[PDB]
Design a protein around this nucleic acid. Structure first.
Ligand SMILES: Nc1ncnc2c1ncn2[C@H]1C[C@H](O)[C@@H](COP(=O)(O)OP(=O)(O)OP(=O)(O)O)O1
Ligand SMILES: [Ca+2]
Length: 1148
DNA sequence: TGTGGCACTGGCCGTCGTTT
DNA sequence: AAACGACGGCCAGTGCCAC
């Protein structure tokens, strides 16, 4: 007695599926070792299909691709408020597979109401190659049976028989349910009257019986409720698991069901022959490119035309003519393209010169053609060159792409690959047939237009954005669970910050308990959190929904729906149901179109510069050795500079003091864990104060120097390693690539294969092999943190460009930096403090003068309206457009009647006041209070207006401003931050000078004050905290120092600043004092005994401090022996001396 | 470590519901 | 049948995945 589950749900039934693809497939395998089969039938989607096929196929299980369709009562177009029913479908052959793909697609594209639904119409259309089963209790026939409409059920049975023929089976399942008894009994009658054959299933949703509760809380995560609600989403029993053929019999006894329902299970599974196209199979689906031109000839054409544009001094009309005579401008390229490969290799046998360039270009074209990739290049070149001629910015390149001269020639790429040390072989390895990946950056504003170009150009049915998913992140998992358990957001957020982040994304909970000693306790305290943490790791291995790729795009060769199912996201984007890898594992052409912020920023910069001073910023024509740019990076003014804005990175650039672009390239490449540590070495060697020696490899030195000299002996770049291994070992440059992959995989002992191969070629070349083995040790060491130079170089250029703008412009530059990141309150705050500490005035927004983004009026910088926090984006434009058709706003009333509450709601209005956007109308506190009365007023004006009434009869013109007391500084500054993310103008701290007097400088004053003191001093600073390496901020600047909106006093050591002690608020305002005199630099000899005797005459026990405003820096001399007795303050302010009773610095 | 993207949720308001 | 209350989405806010 065996059995094969044909109705099984996986993790891909996103709402109620709990069976993970892996442990489900082993449980089927361990239960039935003989010819095991499993059908993936998920709720109205085909997501898992490919990964399920390839996981089951590598486990020796036979996969069956299925679909539990939502079928609409009538038409899939119905948006009726009957409903929809279930139907089990299985694909028996590949045409079957394809039809599932179409149905699953159509369900989403044509039939999506609440769920994606299909028609009995469209089922009939795509019925070829499909087996159908009568379905679960929620299906049509059993549903009709339950409703006592046996006539409708038989009529529907007939309808389906008319569609599927003998590929229709009566589906019989049994859990304890009383409805199942009635349905199956009548189903049994139908099955015998029409001679239909019953198939047993049991609609699994979890793997084993123990998973019932895990699944039951899964539902409580979608239902977003507590374990005890009630009314929380629950299944009727705990039976929906992958049962043993024995447990199946317990539900379906032999003396009542016989063997048929079981035997039919195995028979169907046998007759379900569906093969995809993965691994062994897989066809390359390269879309066709329209062109008496070969696909390979035209790519050639464009390359020759390209070089002439690319290298004007060394590749000319004259030059090409010579090459043809060695056998119009365009006519020569058209001709050179035809030259065959047997003809070409009869010239070579007869610094980057003209001839050198030809060879590299001709070589690359040779490899491209042979692999059969010229079509691929044409497609890419086409849409990039479109985007340029259509006001869409394009990055110089990303990833290995910029290594190809061809790419650069034909304008795919925009950095000279041979000026910098970029290698074609790192992009396409000539010695491995593998499809290259070409990712491209576009202006983030316009990227969609480029995708749209492709959509139109290659076909609507052939272009979609590869799909993206999503796993449940450890942090997000904790928060979602904590919500459910009725835990306050804040203490939950503290639990989420305990989990380490090792590479962008958080670590698992399983670990995060080993790695965090406090995520092994927070559990001991509360029993509530005991569950939360265990539950969150039980739910970790989960996904969100299915987005289109921020970058992923597929151009298929044949209609997408023939192989890959589709979706349409909320913005109408056509999206793949398969992810990145699944799509790529079906051999489909996948590109990345990235929206890059920096590009969008460099556009507004150019625009603003032009309008400001008539200068045409031609980024692709700028000198790359401009002094004032590097001097700015050397000063560490990286505030808005692409790629190098990290706290640490900023410090490193100040340390390095880069002088040429190559410094940026190397800095960006090495600054990462990892490699971060190699930078001090780089610097001391860069500053000509440490020899670069290769004594540890005397015989390899002849190869090492030429490679590692450029970078002071340090292997920084992946390319550097590849070359080392290619030259020392005799490896093919393409093989060295494979080696670097194998260094990265760290394959247990397959690494020892390359070792022996390395030493072999190493001896054969030079090294005595004692070096070889240890040289390989050096490679495996640096290959962990190694780098692709083409990618580094290309990106570095954007950094430069960014910095160059900031160096030379400067106001519009800053306003563009603000504009580009206007929706980030943290960055906006940052950019403002950069601008303000750079010499200009920066004003809060204003409904009468502000534009949408940062704007320059006269000689001031003025915040945009989009900068205000609760104001929508529609509202910001609305306000501005209303101000353009009617005049400037005359008063608050005039504002409120012109812009109905429909558009600028009360919440929005409030922020707008708090920002200072309406300050042109009077006192803020007064404006906030005046709101609701004037909103009532404004709403009432339209009532009279839309009831006839001219202009005097329709307006009892706006009452005065409802009175209230002016806001204090703390509360006013508090509102600003809430409304703008940052403080603008002041000053909070300047309201109580109690703290000012105790503190020991101004964040600004640190460098100036400390320099002249002892060696590596200690100091006390007070400001605000801004980090989850916390950042402290005055009204004068910020600092790195080793939660938010909490003030602190800090005792720390200075060299960078290292914290040693800290403290708190109401506590600080409780501690005190002791007499501080403030003396100028202008003090006589006969004063330092004027002041000395004044204090001598009033003893006590208060220490005396002196603020000596020096020439460069403000010193803090605490007196000596003298201890004043308080009374001295009044008698001291009774002369040209300013004094205060400040809290005593000692105590802290 | 931006940028590009996204869907999911949570904060805040009108409709629908149920209770009276 | 009228006034008082929950669910609705709303729209907005707020993190995680391949480049
Ligand atoms: N972890 C990461 N963080 C940031 N950017 C990344 C990361 N991984 C990749 N990228 C970016 C670099 C590229 O500009 C783009 C394409 O990545 P990827 O295809 O992995 O590398 P590549 O194209 O430079 O090399 P390859 O030849 O190995 O594909 O994504
Ligand atoms: Ca790539």
């Amino acid at each position: 007695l065996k059995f094969a589950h044909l109705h099984q749900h996986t993790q891909f039934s996103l709402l109620n599926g709990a069976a993970k693809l892996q442990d489900l497939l082993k449980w089927v395998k361990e239960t039935t070792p003989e010819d095991p089969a499993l059908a993936m039938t998920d709720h109205g989607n085909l997501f898992g299909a490919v990964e399920f096929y390839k996981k089951a196929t590598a486990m020796g299980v036979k996969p069956i691709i299925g679909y539990e369709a939502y079928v609409a009562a009538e038409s899939r177009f119905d948006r009726k408020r009957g409903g929809y029913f279930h139907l089990t479908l299985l694909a028996k052959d590949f045409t079957g597979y394809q039809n599932l793909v179409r149905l699953a697609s159509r369900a989403y594209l044509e039939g999506f109401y609440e769920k994606p639904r299909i028609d009995r119409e469209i089922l009939r259309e795509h019925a070829q190659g499909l087996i159908a089963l009568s379905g679960c209790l929620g299906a049509e026939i059993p549903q009709f049976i339950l409703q006592d409409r046996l006539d409708l059920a038989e009529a529907r049975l007939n309808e389906d028989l008319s569609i599927f023929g003998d590929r229709f089976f009566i589906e019989i399942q049994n859990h304890g349910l009383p409805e199942q008894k009635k349905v199956n009994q009548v189903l049994k009658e139908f099955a015998r009257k029409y001679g239909l054959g019953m198939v047993a299933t049991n609609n699994g949703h979890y793997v084993r019986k123990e998973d019932a509760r895990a699944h039951e809380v899964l539902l409580a995560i979608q239902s977003k409720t507590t374990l005890d609600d009630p009314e929380r989403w629950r299944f009727p029993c705990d039976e929906f698991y992958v049962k043993t053929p024995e447990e199946m019999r317990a539900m379906l006894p032999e003396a009542e069901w016989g063997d048929e329902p079981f035997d039919n299970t195995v028979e169907i599974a046998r007759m379900c022959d569906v093969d995809l196209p993965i691994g062994d199979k897989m066809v390359y689906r390269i879309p066709r490119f329209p062109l008496g031109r070969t696909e390979a000839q035209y790519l050639r054409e464009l390359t020759f035309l390209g070089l002439l544009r690319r290298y004007p001094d060394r590749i000319t009309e004259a030059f090409y003519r010579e090459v043809l005579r060695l056998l119009d401008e365009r006519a020569l390229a058209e001709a050179l393209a035809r030259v065959e490969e047997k003809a070409w290799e009869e010239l070579r046998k007869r610094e980057w010169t003209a001839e050198a360039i030809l060879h590299r270009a001709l070589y690359e074209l040779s490899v491209i053609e042979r692999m059969g990739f010229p079509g691929y290049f044409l497609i890419v070149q086409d849409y990039i060159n479109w985007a340029r001629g259509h006001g869409v910015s394009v990055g110089p390149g990303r990833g290995s792409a910029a290594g190809s001269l061809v790419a650069y020639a034909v304008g795919i790429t925009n950095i000279d690959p041979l000026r910098f040390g970029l290698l074609f072989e790192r992009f396409l390895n000539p010695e491995r047939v593998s499809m290259p990946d070409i990712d491209t950056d576009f202006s983030d504003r316009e990227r969609d237009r480029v995708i749209q170009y492709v959509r139109e150009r290659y076909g609507e049915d052939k272009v979609a954005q590869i799909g993206t998913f999503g796993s449940l992140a450890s942090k997000a998992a904790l928060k979602d669970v904590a919500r459910v358990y009725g835990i306050p957001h804040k203490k939950a957020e503290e639990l989420a910050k305990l989990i380490p982040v090792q590479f962008g994304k958080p670590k698992p909970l399983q670990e995060a308990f080993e790695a965090e000693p406090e995520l092994r306790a927070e559990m001991e305290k509360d029993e509530r959190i005991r569950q939360v943490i265990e539950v969150a790791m039980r739910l970790e291995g989960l996904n969100r929904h299915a987005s289109v790729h921020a970058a992923g795009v597929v151009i298929a060769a044949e209609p997408l729906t023939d192989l890959v199912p589709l979706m349409r996201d909320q913005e109408g984007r056509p999206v793949t149901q398969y992810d990145m890898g699944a799509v790529e594992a079906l051999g489909l052409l996948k590109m990345d179109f990235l929206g890059l912020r920096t590009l969008t920023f460099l556009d507004e910069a150019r625009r603003i510069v032009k309008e400001s001073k008539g200068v045409e910023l031609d980024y692709d024509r700028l000198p790359l050795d401009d002094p004032k740019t590097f001097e700015l990076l050397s000063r560490g003014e990286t505030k808005g500079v692409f790629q190098l804005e990290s706290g640490g990175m900023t410090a490193t650039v100040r340390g390095l003091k880069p002088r040429r672009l190559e410094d940026i390239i190397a800095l960006v490449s090495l600054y990462r864990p990892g490699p971060m540590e190699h930078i001090p070495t780089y610097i001391r060697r860069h500053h000509g104060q440490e020899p670069v020696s290769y004594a540890e490899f005397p015989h390899a030195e002849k190869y090492l120097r030429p490679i590692l000299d450029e970078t002071y002996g340090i292997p920084v770049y992946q390319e550097q390693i590849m070359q080392i291994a290619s030259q020392v070992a005799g490896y093919s440059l393409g093989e060295a690539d494979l080696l670097r992959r194998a260094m990265g995989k760290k394959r247990v002992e397959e690494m020892q294969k390359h070792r022996e191969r390395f030493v072999r070629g190493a001896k054969e070349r030079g090294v005595p092999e004692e070096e070889a083995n240890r040289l390989f040790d050096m490679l495996e060491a640096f290959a962990n943190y190694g780098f692709n130079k083409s990618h580094a170089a290309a990106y570095s250029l954007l950094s430069y460009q960014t910095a160059y703008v900031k160096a030379h412009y400067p106001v519009e530059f800053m306003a563009a930096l603000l504009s580009v990141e206007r929706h980030d309150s943290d960055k906006v705050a940052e950019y403002i403090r950069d601008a303000r500490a750079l010499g200009i005035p920066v004003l809060p927004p204003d409904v009468n003068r502000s534009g949408f983004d940062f704007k320059v009026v006269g000689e001031e910088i003025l915040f945009g309206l989009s900068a205000v926090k609760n104001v929508g984006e529609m509202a910001a434009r609305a306000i501005l457009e209303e101000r353009e058709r009617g005049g400037p706003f005359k008063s608050l009333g005039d504002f409120l009647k012109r812009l109905p509450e429909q558009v600028v709601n009360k919440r929005a209005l409030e922020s707008l006041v708090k920002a200072g956007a309406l300050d042109a109308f009077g006192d803020r506190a007064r404006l906030l209070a005046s709101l609701e009365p004037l909103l009532r007023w404004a709403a009432e004006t339209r009532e009279r207006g839309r009831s006839g009434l001219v202009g005097l009869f329709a307006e009892v013109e706006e009452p005065p401003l409802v009175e209230a007391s002016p806001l204090d500084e703390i509360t006013m500054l508090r509102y600003e931050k809430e409304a703008l993310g940052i403080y603008v103008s002041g000053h909070p701290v300047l309201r109580y000078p109690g703290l000012r007097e105790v503190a020991s400088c101004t964040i600004e004053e640190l460098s100036e004050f400390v320099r002249e003191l002892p060696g590596k001093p200690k100091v006390l600073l007070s400001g605000m905290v801004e980090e989850v390496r916390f950042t402290l901020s005055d009204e004068t600047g910020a600092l790195e120092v080793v939660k938010e909106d909490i003030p602190l006093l800090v005792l720390a050591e200075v060299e960078r600043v290292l914290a040693q002690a800290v403290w708190t608020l109401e506590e600080v305002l409780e501690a005190p004092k002791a007499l501080e005199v403030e003396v100028d630099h202008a003090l006589l000899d006969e004063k330092g005994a004027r002041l000395k005797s004044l204090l001598d005459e009033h003893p006590g026990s208060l220490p005396v401090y002196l603020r000596v405003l020096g020439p460069f820096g403000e010193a803090l001399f605490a007196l000596r022996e003298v201890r004043v007795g308080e009374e001295a303050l009044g008698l001291l302010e009774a002369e040209g001396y300013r004094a205060y009773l400040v809290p005593d610095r000692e105590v802290f």
